[PDB]
Amino acid sequence: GPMPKLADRKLCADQECSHPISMAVALQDYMAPDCRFLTIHRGQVVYVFSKLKGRGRLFWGGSVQGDYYGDLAARLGYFPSSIVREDQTLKPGKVDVKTDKWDFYC
């Protein structure tokens, strides 16, 4: 019935998933199929905050960098990991936590 969660568990840099795991650059375009996902275009910078596990492991969560130095969109959304190239690890994405009800809400 209701939209099933994309995953039951995820990997983060910390329990709250508030620190980014990595900085990545998009290699492919990706238009979000619904509000849970992030729309990205080749060349954009994405800060990765979560990596889903198990059934949702193709997808990562993060935010897109803006146009002025230092700008990161507030909105978090999911995207296929394969569309980006991770360029710098900021923190190990080792903290294994459960996804909550708010993770896939939009």
From Swiss-Prot:
Highest rank taxon of the organism: Eukaryota
Disulphide bond pairs: C12-C17, C35-C106
Intracellular or extracellular location(s): Secreted
Entry keyword set: Disulfide bond, Growth factor, Secreted, SH3 domain, Signal
GO CC terms of this entry: extracellular space
GO biological process terms, semicolon-separated: extracellular matrix organization
Tissue: All malignant melanoma cell lines tested and infrequently in glioma cell lines.
GO molecular function: growth factor activity
Segments forming domain SH3: 19-89
Description of post-translational modifications: May possess two intramolecular disulfide bonds.
Similarity comment text for this entry: Belongs to the MIA/OTOR family.
Subunit structure: Interacts with FASLG. Interacts with TMIGD2.
Task performed by this protein: Elicits growth inhibition on melanoma cells in vitro as well as some other neuroectodermal tumors, including gliomas.
Protein name: Melanoma-derived growth regulatory protein
Gene, per the UniProt record: MIA
